[PDB]
Design an enzyme around this catalytic site. Sequence first.
Site, PDB file in Angstrom:
ATOM      1  N   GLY B  12       0.696  -1.276   0.000  1.00  0.00           N
ATOM      2  CA  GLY B  12       0.000   0.000   0.000  1.00  0.00           C
ATOM      3  C   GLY B  12       0.726   1.330   0.000  1.00  0.00           C
ATOM      4  N   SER B  18       0.941   8.498   2.079  1.00  0.00           N
ATOM      5  CA  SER B  18       0.423   7.174   2.403  1.00  0.00           C
ATOM      6  C   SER B  18       0.687   6.753   3.841  1.00  0.00           C
ATOM      7  CB  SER B  18       1.028   6.121   1.465  1.00  0.00           C
ATOM      8  OG  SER B  18       0.499   6.216   0.152  1.00  0.00           O
ATOM      9  N   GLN B  39       0.799  -2.104  -6.742  1.00  0.00           N
ATOM     10  CA  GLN B  39      -0.360  -2.618  -7.448  1.00  0.00           C
ATOM     11  C   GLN B  39      -0.269  -2.730  -8.963  1.00  0.00           C
ATOM     12  OE1 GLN B  39      -5.197  -1.677  -7.795  1.00  0.00           O
ATOM     13  NE2 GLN B  39      -3.855  -0.318  -6.593  1.00  0.00           N
ATOM     14  N   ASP B  63      -1.534  -7.707  -7.113  1.00  0.00           N
ATOM     15  CA  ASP B  63      -2.911  -7.232  -7.181  1.00  0.00           C
ATOM     16  C   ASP B  63      -3.731  -8.210  -6.333  1.00  0.00           C
ATOM     17  OD1 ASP B  63      -5.532  -6.611  -7.731  1.00  0.00           O
ATOM     18  OD2 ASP B  63      -5.195  -6.312  -9.884  1.00  0.00           O
ATOM     19  N   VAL B  64      -4.027  -7.822  -5.094  1.00  0.00           N
ATOM     20  CA  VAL B  64      -4.776  -8.684  -4.185  1.00  0.00           C
ATOM     21  C   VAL B  64      -6.117  -9.161  -4.733  1.00  0.00           C
ATOM     22  CG1 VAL B  64      -3.656  -7.589  -2.219  1.00  0.00           C
ATOM     23  CG2 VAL B  64      -5.874  -6.774  -2.990  1.00  0.00           C
ATOM     24  N   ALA B  94     -13.185   0.763  -2.639  1.00  0.00           N
ATOM     25  CA  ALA B  94     -14.608   0.667  -2.932  1.00  0.00           C
ATOM     26  C   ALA B  94     -14.829   1.478  -4.212  1.00  0.00           C
ATOM     27  CB  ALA B  94     -15.430   1.254  -1.789  1.00  0.00           C
ATOM     28  N   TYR B 155     -19.268   7.044   4.271  1.00  0.00           N
ATOM     29  CA  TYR B 155     -18.293   5.954   4.343  1.00  0.00           C
ATOM     30  C   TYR B 155     -18.967   4.699   3.824  1.00  0.00           C
ATOM     31  CZ  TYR B 155     -14.186   3.441   5.943  1.00  0.00           C
ATOM     32  OH  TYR B 155     -13.032   2.693   5.945  1.00  0.00           O
ATOM     33  N   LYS B 162     -14.960  -2.872   6.451  1.00  0.00           N
ATOM     34  CA  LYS B 162     -14.024  -2.751   7.559  1.00  0.00           C
ATOM     35  C   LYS B 162     -14.437  -3.646   8.735  1.00  0.00           C
ATOM     36  CE  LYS B 162     -10.872   0.138   6.098  1.00  0.00           C
ATOM     37  NZ  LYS B 162      -9.520  -0.416   5.797  1.00  0.00           N
ATOM     38  N   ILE B 191      -7.042  11.029   8.291  1.00  0.00           N
ATOM     39  CA  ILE B 191      -5.802  11.666   7.859  1.00  0.00           C
ATOM     40  C   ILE B 191      -5.961  11.991   6.374  1.00  0.00           C
ATOM     41  CG2 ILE B 191      -3.301  11.452   7.597  1.00  0.00           C
ATOM     42  CD1 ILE B 191      -3.401   9.100   9.563  1.00  0.00           C
ATOM     43  N   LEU B 194      -4.066  10.112  -0.112  1.00  0.00           N
ATOM     44  CA  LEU B 194      -4.559   9.716  -1.432  1.00  0.00           C
ATOM     45  C   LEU B 194      -5.641   8.632  -1.333  1.00  0.00           C
ATOM     46  CD1 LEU B 194      -4.473   9.608  -4.522  1.00  0.00           C
ATOM     47  CD2 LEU B 194      -2.254   8.421  -4.368  1.00  0.00           C
TER      48      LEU B 194
HETATM   49  N1  LIG Z   1      -6.309   8.035   5.418  1.00  0.00           N
HETATM   50  C1  LIG Z   1      -7.243   7.851   6.359  1.00  0.00           C
HETATM   51  O1  LIG Z   1      -7.966   8.774   6.777  1.00  0.00           O
HETATM   52  C2  LIG Z   1      -7.398   6.459   6.897  1.00  0.00           C
HETATM   53  C3  LIG Z   1      -7.911   6.290   8.222  1.00  0.00           C
HETATM   54  C4  LIG Z   1      -8.084   4.986   8.760  1.00  0.00           C
HETATM   55  C5  LIG Z   1      -7.754   3.835   8.013  1.00  0.00           C
HETATM   56  N2  LIG Z   1      -7.241   3.982   6.699  1.00  0.00           N
HETATM   57  C6  LIG Z   1      -6.895   2.723   5.965  1.00  0.00           C
HETATM   58  O2  LIG Z   1      -5.455   2.624   5.717  1.00  0.00           O
HETATM   59  C7  LIG Z   1      -5.190   1.990   4.446  1.00  0.00           C
HETATM   60  C8  LIG Z   1      -4.315   2.926   3.608  1.00  0.00           C
HETATM   61  O3  LIG Z   1      -5.025   4.085   3.129  1.00  0.00           O
HETATM   62  P1  LIG Z   1      -4.301   5.488   2.706  1.00  0.00           P
HETATM   63  O4  LIG Z   1      -5.012   6.585   3.423  1.00  0.00           O
HETATM   64  O5  LIG Z   1      -2.827   5.339   2.916  1.00  0.00           O
HETATM   65  O6  LIG Z   1      -4.588   5.629   1.116  1.00  0.00           O
HETATM   66  P2  LIG Z   1      -3.685   5.357  -0.201  1.00  0.00           P
HETATM   67  O7  LIG Z   1      -4.557   5.490  -1.413  1.00  0.00           O
HETATM   68  O8  LIG Z   1      -2.497   6.289  -0.123  1.00  0.00           O
HETATM   69  O9  LIG Z   1      -3.151   3.798  -0.100  1.00  0.00           O
HETATM   70  C9  LIG Z   1      -4.007   2.628  -0.197  1.00  0.00           C
HETATM   71  C10 LIG Z   1      -3.480   1.618  -1.220  1.00  0.00           C
HETATM   72  O10 LIG Z   1      -4.583   0.843  -1.733  1.00  0.00           O
HETATM   73  C11 LIG Z   1      -3.848   0.041  -2.681  1.00  0.00           C
HETATM   74  N3  LIG Z   1      -4.751  -0.914  -3.476  1.00  0.00           N
HETATM   75  C12 LIG Z   1      -6.057  -0.783  -3.858  1.00  0.00           C
HETATM   76  N4  LIG Z   1      -6.478  -1.857  -4.559  1.00  0.00           N
HETATM   77  C13 LIG Z   1      -5.399  -2.639  -4.595  1.00  0.00           C
HETATM   78  C14 LIG Z   1      -5.300  -3.915  -5.228  1.00  0.00           C
HETATM   79  N5  LIG Z   1      -6.343  -4.440  -5.864  1.00  0.00           N
HETATM   80  N6  LIG Z   1      -4.080  -4.565  -5.146  1.00  0.00           N
HETATM   81  C15 LIG Z   1      -3.010  -4.021  -4.494  1.00  0.00           C
HETATM   82  N7  LIG Z   1      -3.098  -2.795  -3.886  1.00  0.00           N
HETATM   83  C16 LIG Z   1      -4.294  -2.088  -3.932  1.00  0.00           C
HETATM   84  C17 LIG Z   1      -3.119   1.080  -3.556  1.00  0.00           C
HETATM   85  O11 LIG Z   1      -1.913   0.652  -4.194  1.00  0.00           O
HETATM   86  C18 LIG Z   1      -2.863   2.178  -2.504  1.00  0.00           C
HETATM   87  O12 LIG Z   1      -1.476   2.523  -2.366  1.00  0.00           O
HETATM   88  C19 LIG Z   1      -6.580   1.672   3.875  1.00  0.00           C
HETATM   89  O13 LIG Z   1      -6.935   0.302   4.101  1.00  0.00           O
HETATM   90  C20 LIG Z   1      -7.512   2.644   4.589  1.00  0.00           C
HETATM   91  O14 LIG Z   1      -8.858   2.167   4.572  1.00  0.00           O
HETATM   92  C21 LIG Z   1      -7.058   5.302   6.125  1.00  0.00           C
HETATM   93  C1  LIG Z   2     -10.801   5.917   6.256  1.00  0.00           C
HETATM   94  N1  LIG Z   2     -10.829   6.217   4.834  1.00  0.00           N
HETATM   95  C2  LIG Z   2     -10.896   7.673   4.496  1.00  0.00           C
HETATM   96  C3  LIG Z   2     -12.313   8.156   4.597  1.00  0.00           C
HETATM   97  C4  LIG Z   2     -13.287   8.058   3.553  1.00  0.00           C
HETATM   98  C5  LIG Z   2     -14.463   8.640   4.119  1.00  0.00           C
HETATM   99  C6  LIG Z   2     -15.828   8.881   3.655  1.00  0.00           C
HETATM  100  C7  LIG Z   2     -16.791   9.506   4.500  1.00  0.00           C
HETATM  101  C8  LIG Z   2     -16.435   9.910   5.836  1.00  0.00           C
HETATM  102  C9  LIG Z   2     -15.118   9.697   6.337  1.00  0.00           C
HETATM  103  C10 LIG Z   2     -14.184   9.074   5.464  1.00  0.00           C
HETATM  104  N2  LIG Z   2     -12.838   8.772   5.765  1.00  0.00           N
HETATM  105  C11 LIG Z   2     -12.142   9.055   7.047  1.00  0.00           C
HETATM  106  C12 LIG Z   2     -10.800   5.128   3.901  1.00  0.00           C
HETATM  107  O1  LIG Z   2     -10.747   3.965   4.293  1.00  0.00           O
HETATM  108  C13 LIG Z   2     -10.830   5.280   2.411  1.00  0.00           C
HETATM  109  C14 LIG Z   2     -11.709   4.479   1.656  1.00  0.00           C
HETATM  110  C15 LIG Z   2     -11.795   4.548   0.171  1.00  0.00           C
HETATM  111  C16 LIG Z   2     -11.833   5.898  -0.555  1.00  0.00           C
HETATM  112  C17 LIG Z   2     -11.926   5.947  -1.977  1.00  0.00           C
HETATM  113  C18 LIG Z   2     -11.986   4.710  -2.737  1.00  0.00           C
HETATM  114  N3  LIG Z   2     -12.083   4.821  -4.141  1.00  0.00           N
HETATM  115  N4  LIG Z   2     -11.946   3.418  -2.035  1.00  0.00           N
HETATM  116  C19 LIG Z   2     -11.852   3.363  -0.595  1.00  0.00           C
END
Ligand SMILES: NC(=O)c1ccc[n+]([C@@H]2O[C@H](COP(=O)([O-])OP(=O)(O)OC[C@H]3O[C@@H](n4cnc5c(N)ncnc54)[C@H](O)[C@@H]3O)[C@@H](O)[C@H]2O)c1
Ligand SMILES: CN(Cc1cc2ccccc2n1C)C(=O)/C=C/c1ccc(N)nc1
Lengths: 251, 251, 251, 251
Positions: B12, B18, B39, B63-64, B94, B155, B162, B191, B194
């Site tokens: 990821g 990230s 990916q 690619d999971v 999603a 969400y 989740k 946070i 991307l």
């Molecule tokens: N940013 C936030 O606010 C936040 C808060 C809580 C939890 N999270 C969780 O943390 C994780 C990382 O999110 P992020 O904020 O760093 O976003 P991000 O987009 O920077 O990274 C998420 C990764 O998803 C990977 N991905 C999607 N489909 C894939 C596939 N089919 N095969 C391989 N890789 C794939 C992409 O390569 C990407 O780098 C997520 O699971 C997210 O739900 C994010």
């Molecule tokens: C925790 N988050 C960020 C986030 C999305 C979101 C939507 C509504 C409210 C809060 C929200 N937060 C914190 C995620 O897991 C991201 C999910 C996500 C976003 C776009 C996408 N194409 N697939 C998955």
Amino acid sequence: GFLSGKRILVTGVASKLSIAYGIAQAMHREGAELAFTYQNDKLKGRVEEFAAQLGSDIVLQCDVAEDASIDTMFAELGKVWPKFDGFVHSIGFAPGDQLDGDYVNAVTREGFKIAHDISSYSFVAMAKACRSMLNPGSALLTLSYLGAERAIPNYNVMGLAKASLEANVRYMANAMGPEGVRVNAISAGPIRTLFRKMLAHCEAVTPIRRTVTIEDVGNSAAFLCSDLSAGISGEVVHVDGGFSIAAMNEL
Amino acid sequence: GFLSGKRILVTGVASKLSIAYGIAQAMHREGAELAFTYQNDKLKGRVEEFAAQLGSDIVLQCDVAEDASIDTMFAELGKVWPKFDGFVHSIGFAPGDQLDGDYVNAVTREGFKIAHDISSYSFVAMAKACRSMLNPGSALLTLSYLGAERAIPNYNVMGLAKASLEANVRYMANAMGPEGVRVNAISAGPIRTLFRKMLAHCEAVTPIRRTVTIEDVGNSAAFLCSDLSAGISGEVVHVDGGFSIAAMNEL
Amino acid sequence: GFLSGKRILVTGVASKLSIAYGIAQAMHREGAELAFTYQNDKLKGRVEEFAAQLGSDIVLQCDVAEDASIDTMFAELGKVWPKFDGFVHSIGFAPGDQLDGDYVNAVTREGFKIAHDISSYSFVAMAKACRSMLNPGSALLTLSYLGAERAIPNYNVMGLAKASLEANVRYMANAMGPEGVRVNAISAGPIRTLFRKMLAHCEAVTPIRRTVTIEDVGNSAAFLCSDLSAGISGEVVHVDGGFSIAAMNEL
Amino acid sequence: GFLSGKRILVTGVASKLSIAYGIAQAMHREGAELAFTYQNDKLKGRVEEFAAQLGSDIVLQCDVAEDASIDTMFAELGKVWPKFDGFVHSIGFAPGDQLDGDYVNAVTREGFKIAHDISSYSFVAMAKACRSMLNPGSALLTLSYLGAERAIPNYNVMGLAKASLEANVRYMANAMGPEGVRVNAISAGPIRTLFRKMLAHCEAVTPIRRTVTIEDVGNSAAFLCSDLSAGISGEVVHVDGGFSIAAMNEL
Ligand SMILES: NC(=O)c1ccc[n+]([C@@H]2O[C@H](COP(=O)([O-])OP(=O)(O)OC[C@H]3O[C@@H](n4cnc5c(N)ncnc54)[C@H](O)[C@@H]3O)[C@@H](O)[C@H]2O)c1
Ligand SMILES: CN(Cc1cc2ccccc2n1C)C(=O)/C=C/c1ccc(N)nc1
Ligand SMILES: NC(=O)c1ccc[n+]([C@@H]2O[C@H](COP(=O)([O-])OP(=O)(O)OC[C@H]3O[C@@H](n4cnc5c(N)ncnc54)[C@H](O)[C@@H]3O)[C@@H](O)[C@H]2O)c1
Ligand SMILES: NC(=O)c1ccc[n+]([C@@H]2O[C@H](COP(=O)([O-])OP(=O)(O)OC[C@H]3O[C@@H](n4cnc5c(N)ncnc54)[C@H](O)[C@@H]3O)[C@@H](O)[C@H]2O)c1
Ligand SMILES: NC(=O)c1ccc[n+]([C@@H]2O[C@H](COP(=O)([O-])OP(=O)(O)OC[C@H]3O[C@@H](n4cnc5c(N)ncnc54)[C@H](O)[C@@H]3O)[C@@H](O)[C@H]2O)c1
Ligand SMILES: CN(Cc1cc2ccccc2n1C)C(=O)/C=C/c1ccc(N)nc1
Ligand SMILES: CN(Cc1cc2ccccc2n1C)C(=O)/C=C/c1ccc(N)nc1
Ligand SMILES: CN(Cc1cc2ccccc2n1C)C(=O)/C=C/c1ccc(N)nc1
């Protein structure tokens, strides 16, 4: 009864031992008009029979795996119930192979897909297809299991499905609540339906020292779908005699 | 560093923002030897660049969504790391049209399918693929969010995925514990990576009075994957400044 | 060590088996400067001996049952540590006659009083007394047990006191967050200290297949009190090998 | 009604706005014979009146702060009800000073003592004094609030008391369940009883978009003390329109 004047659709009735049966039994007793669905022909007749006993001739077929099927079922239902007050989601499934032995070895992408689609998505799928048909004050109810909150041996992937389902309950309640619709679930304790060694353990460790019956569940279900529980939505009510709130009673 | 001697795989990483990125650095600082996945063709470049900076040159494609891609990736990893000590699962997805507006109306069977498949099944599918390669004392970590425990606007289906994921954590933890593998998740606070109006809100009602950083999450990740957390498994550690344990703070 | 530069106060050291003891060492190993308290004349000796071993010579008397004793102890601590970075609250007590047999019959108003007072109020009373002395970035930690979330035989009133304590953690965390203080608890699995049949059971049904050690708890404590856990507050981290997230493992 | 033939004692009835009043109102409607208690003389007459309206002339005085008082009350009750089927615990209190401003500054050892003694211990105190008088199938119910699970501004020490109380529910249910006695609690959403800005926030963010009424609670209470909920014990049923299961609806 406290369900007088309510119209409820009941899914998942497969036999007299089905939780759905005990729920229908109890809702009928409380004066609710019922409607039933049946997965496939192998049950049509058998289900129409249970329905007659509860003053119902509304027995529609429906495969929740298919959107078209669900839409078609509610179309028919509409003919006789242009409006109703909610339905009971008593549907759970996962390919047999998935439910035995180490979880990580047993689970498969396909196994995961089906278990989640059928045991969790179908709930919102149904709400989605009948949303415009619900009267204010309607109530939606689904059945979950402790496997969603804790890791239970052999339950495996069905545990992840139930958790997804319990969250579906919260999101569904949150989305529909504003239009006068409540959504809840009942996490029932183990019951003998269409393992024995387990019911043994449960009985000795459960506070009420006995497993719950479809009757105990049927009553909670009726309550949860009646105006008596108007202040409850998005809740996962545990009807397991308090099994989950105790620990190490076995020792 | 409390991770010296550990070979951990980090999925990821997409950019300096990230979460997996904040995790990789923290783990690196603490002396871990890292491997990276990417990916597709669009990301390979950026992932190799970052890996180079952290002293690693093990950048594998994966690619999971495909079992073959996972087996192949772990086959290549085997050439350099016959065995290792766990991996970080920071993958979540999603279909765009799913995270907007009323949940019941946005969700669809496909969107639901993809969300759960990529956000939840991919975690255990990965454990499946490398189970024999894991050293006793290995730890697995994934990232979740509060939308799993409570209904959060927009969400939507991710909230269901989740929850399925947090349950996976429990089952995986229970299945693999006997061979010396721990499995936990970090439920991170919001946070920007991307939404602005949400952060402003969170910072005001969060106990510590600010949103968490990928450093905060990073440090907690390094810990959950080190032998320091040897007594924690199947747990969902909240790293959100205590946001979730408060209520009605706005007033 | 990830605690270098931190002055932490550790209460509850009673013997080499003590949990606070496992915590003191871990914190010491990581470079923390420690202060110790002792309840009475019976323990002062052993506490000074241990403190000496960990490079400290700040051994202060304190009976959390008395506000004066707490103010005085923090007054003495002030002479050497005008300010510090938090303290470990490893204190728990219920009148002996309370932890045996049927809960409703064993509990009494006094036993209940003492249990809550010593096991829960003492934690915030201590925070009260040193609030101005705490540096931004300080962390407070207490120890709880599963009897707080579930009804465990014989644990009886302590279960109520631990719940009051875990709630205290949340309120304290919410009140002090703005000034830079984090407050968390570790819900530790059973450990034989100052019961055999219970351990045998736990080790068999615990995911990691063993009970936690004061080292395991110790390492998690050091972490929860270091800036590495900067993103965690008002949380109850389970350090019990995942025992609580499983169910029906005996079968 | 579904309470026909049951005898229930109801505490905490102070006015027509009291939750206890709405509960009594609903239990009476369902055919249950009632008995009431009153803290002090300043209410005797006023309480006897509410009682008459519900076909009851059993109005006994009782200060739950005193064991002698509770024993005396059940002695009197015994004269008219040698046996009954449970009671409703609707008692909560904490010195005014405790409920406003920063929790850590407001709380006091004494404040903590009283709040826990009156709001939590009295529940088991009552069960203790009438245990031999309960018929099989009896049910005990108490009222809690979200402040027990989350840190709510100004609720302060009352939050720790409610948590202690919610655990008391689990231990009580676990101890008495084997003799055919169930114990539960209802976590009610905010209501206007013997703040306004708050009910505002609650209404807009609650799923059913409205605060619960003593009627909504009364019905859940009646259900929880009737044989309809025979499969439920040790549960904390949320009757707050789903307020607690949602998050960030305000945004
Ligand atoms: N940013 C936030 O606010 C936040 C808060 C809580 C939890 N999270 C969780 O943390 C994780 C990382 O999110 P992020 O904020 O760093 O976003 P991000 O987009 O920077 O990274 C998420 C990764 O998803 C990977 N991905 C999607 N489909 C894939 C596939 N089919 N095969 C391989 N890789 C794939 C992409 O390569 C990407 O780098 C997520 O699971 C997210 O739900 C994010
Ligand atoms: C925790 N988050 C960020 C986030 C999305 C979101 C939507 C509504 C409210 C809060 C929200 N937060 C914190 C995620 O897991 C991201 C999910 C996500 C976003 C776009 C996408 N194409 N697939 C998955
Ligand atoms: N039996 C228990 O121990 C227990 C305990 C708690 C919760 N539950 C849950 O309650 C529900 C009812 O289970 P049960 O014990 O009554 O079993 P059951 O076999 O009697 O009934 C479940 C129903 O699944 C339906 N079904 C399966 N696939 C379907 C599909 N594709 N389309 C439409 N219908 C389909 C069948 O028609 C069947 O009637 C399930 O969701 C189950 O997970 C069961
Ligand atoms: N050992 C376990 O199985 C276990 C598991 C989970 C949580 N805990 C918790 O961890 C903490 C430490 O327990 P332990 O197992 O190390 O036992 P322990 O007896 O070794 O230490 C507990 C301390 O309580 C202190 N104490 C009691 N009343 C006091 C008072 N009035 N003033 C000052 N100090 C007082 C004593 O000095 C003693 O050292 C407790 O809060 C306990 O509830 C223990
Ligand atoms: N009002 C709310 O917003 C709300 C919401 C959820 C739960 N609750 C809980 O429900 C219960 C009932 O509260 P209410 O809102 O009806 O308030 P209320 O003031 O109408 O009634 C509470 C009762 O406390 C009793 N009481 C206080 N000290 C007592 C003592 N020492 N001995 C005997 N009785 C004593 C009084 O007789 C009084 O009738 C409480 O436990 C409360 O915490 C209230
Ligand atoms: C609660 N239950 C019953 C149950 C199945 C099961 C499997 C392993 C361990 C416990 C188990 N319990 C209680 C269910 O939800 C049923 C799930 C289920 C069973 C068969 C099937 N083909 N699809 C789904
Ligand atoms: C977690 N524990 C240990 C413990 C006691 C106990 C009683 C019954 C079941 C498990 C139990 N465990 C793990 C504690 O907090 C100790 C409490 C305690 C013991 C004696 C005492 N005099 N005061 C308090
Ligand atoms: C749920 N409530 C009502 C309530 C009081 C309160 C105080 C601060 C914030 C919210 C609050 N709510 C909802 C209660 O349990 C009542 C507690 C209470 C009030 C006064 C008092 N003297 N003793 C106890």
